[PDB]
DNA sequence: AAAA
């Protein structure tokens, strides 16, 4: 019985079900856009759930016993089993507010608000929006316009690597005991992605000390003529609160959002213009003691860390969020050094990163 | 808006 709970499933790359999910997975984007959110939670749990299967669905059949799959979406799998496409997922990519929302927004800098916007007024390519003389852009949105081919291309595995290096040898020369971890889709096995992102560290970092690092890397990268772009969140948190109760928990720790200059050199690829590609980078910064929660979270997928924080809640009468696990029942906070830790304080056989691409 |  494959349970309702991505943390309770294992989902591995190997998709034999693309046909399906792709469809659901716009359905979805598409009810994101429309602000339904009830109608995109559907469509993401059935989407989740069939990307967990070891088979690929070849009649209706198939589909009994699986969980989250309602009505609609048997609708939806049954017309893709009919003549291998979705007719409402075609609808969908060619409707004028869908392919608007999916285009703005794939500049760095631009949301749901002003890619309405932008709709309404009467825009429907990037060439109009950016040759435009009255309208006013975000320092975000200049960075997002002026690197958008690089930040539009996929990062691969060999430029992730190459930022990896960038970043620890940055973080090293001002934390010498700093751990710095890849987290996010390339942590779950992806081979591309939109950025790269990673987690740091340190064991014996004062307060002060781990509130200057990302000011320090950043600066040194500044003087190298790297930093594209940055912008960097200062700390919320807050060492003895009780984990969130959101659906979606927001995170607390110190970060930033940068563009990074990566030098075609650094690259060890198997293969060139301008000799270097901007890079999305994203840097965590989180005390010692929180790293395991903070690892787990920033790992994902999304889908992955809602239901995990759904069982806590609902199964274990437990909050889980980024910065902790606290156990409502025994009125503890649950320590971790380690995702395996946190996985057992939960009751969870342990869901390797490249299984958690629910 | 940036974020798995
Ligand atoms: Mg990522
Ligand atoms: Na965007
Ligand atoms: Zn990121």
């Given at each position: 019985?494959?349970?309702q709970?991505?943390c309770?499933?294992?989902?591995?790359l190997?998709?034999?079900?693309?046909?399906?999910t792709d469809?659901?997975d716009?359905?979805?984007?598409?009810?994101?856009?429309?602000?339904?959110?009830?109608?995109?939670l559907?469509?993401?749990?059935?989407?989740?759930?069939?990307?967990?299967?070891?088979?690929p669905?070849?009649?209706?059949?198939?589909?009994?016993?699986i969980?989250?799959?309602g009505?609609?979406?048997k609708?939806?799998?049954?017309g893709?089993?009919?003549?291998?496409?979705?007719?409402?997922a075609?609808?969908?990519?060619?409707?004028?507010?869908?392919k608007?929302?999916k285009?703005?927004?794939?500049?760095?800098?631009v949301?749901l608000?002003?890619?309405?916007?932008?709709f309404?007024?009467?825009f429907?390519?990037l060439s109009?929006?950016?040759?435009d003389?009255?309208?006013?852009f975000?320092?975000?949105?200049?960075?997002?316009?002026?690197?958008?081919?690089?930040?539009?291309?996929?990062?691969?595995?060999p430029?992730?690597?190459?930022?990896s290096?960038?970043?620890?040898?940055?973080?090293?020369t001002?934390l010498?005991?700093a751990?710095?971890?890849?987290?996010?889709?390339?942590?779950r096995?992806?081979?591309?992605?939109?950025?790269?992102?990673?987690?740091?560290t340190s064991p014996?970092?004062?307060?002060?000390?781990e509130?200057?690092?990302?000011?320090?890397?950043?600066?040194?990268?500044?003087?190298?003529?790297?930093?594209?772009?940055?912008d960097?969140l200062?700390?919320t948190?807050?060492?003895?609160?009780?984990?969130s109760?959101?659906?979606?928990?927001?995170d607390?720790?110190?970060?930033?959002?940068?563009?990074?200059?990566?030098?075609?050199?650094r690259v060890?690829s198997?293969?060139?213009?301008?000799?270097?590609?901007?890079?999305?980078?994203?840097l965590?910064?989180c005390?010692?003691?929180?790293?395991?929660?903070a690892?787990?979270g920033?790992?994902?997928?999304?889908?992955?860390?809602?239901?995990?924080r759904?069982?806590?809640?609902?199964?274990?009468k437990?909050?889980?969020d980024?910065?902790?696990?606290?156990?409502?029942?025994?009125?503890?906070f649950?320590?971790?050094?380690?995702?395996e830790?946190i996985?057992?304080?939960?009751?969870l056989?342990?869901?390797?990163?490249?299984?958690?691409?629910?």
């Open positions: 019985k494959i349970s709970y991505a309770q499933r294992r989902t591995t190997n998709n034999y079900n693309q046909l399906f469809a659901l716009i359905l979805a984007e598409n009810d994101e856009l429309r602000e339904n959110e009830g109608s995109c559907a469509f993401m749990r059935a989407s989740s759930v069939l990307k967990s299967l070891p088979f669905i070849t009649s209706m059949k198939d589909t009994e016993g969980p989250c799959l009505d609609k979406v609708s939806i799998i049954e893709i089993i009919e003549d291998g496409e979705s007719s409402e075609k609808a969908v990519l060619n409707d004028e507010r869908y608007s929302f285009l703005f927004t794939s500049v760095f800098g949301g608000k002003t890619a309405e916007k932008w309404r007024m009467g429907r390519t109009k929006i950016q040759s003389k009255s309208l006013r975000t320092q975000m949105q200049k960075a997002g316009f002026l690197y958008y081919e690089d930040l539009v291309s996929c990062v691969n595995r430029e992730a690597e190459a930022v290096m960038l970043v620890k040898e940055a973080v090293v001002f010498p005991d751990l710095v971890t890849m987290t996010g889709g390339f942590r096995g992806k081979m591309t992605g939109h950025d790269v992102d990673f987690l740091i014996e970092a004062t307060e002060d000390e509130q200057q690092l990302l000011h320090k890397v950043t600066d040194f990268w500044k003087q190298q003529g790297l930093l594209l772009y940055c960097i200062e700390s948190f807050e060492k003895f609160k009780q984990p109760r959101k659906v979606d928990a927001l607390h720790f110190q970060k930033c959002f940068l563009i990074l200059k990566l030098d075609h050199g060890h198997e293969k060139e213009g301008k000799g270097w590609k901007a890079i999305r980078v994203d965590v910064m005390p010692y003691d929180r790293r395991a929660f690892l787990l920033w790992t994902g997928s999304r889908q992955f860390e809602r239901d995990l759904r069982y806590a809640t609902h199964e274990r437990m909050m889980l980024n910065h902790a696990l606290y156990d409502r029942t025994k009125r503890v649950l320590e971790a050094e380690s995702e830790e996985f057992a304080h939960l009751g056989d342990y869901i390797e990163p490249w299984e958690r691409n629910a």
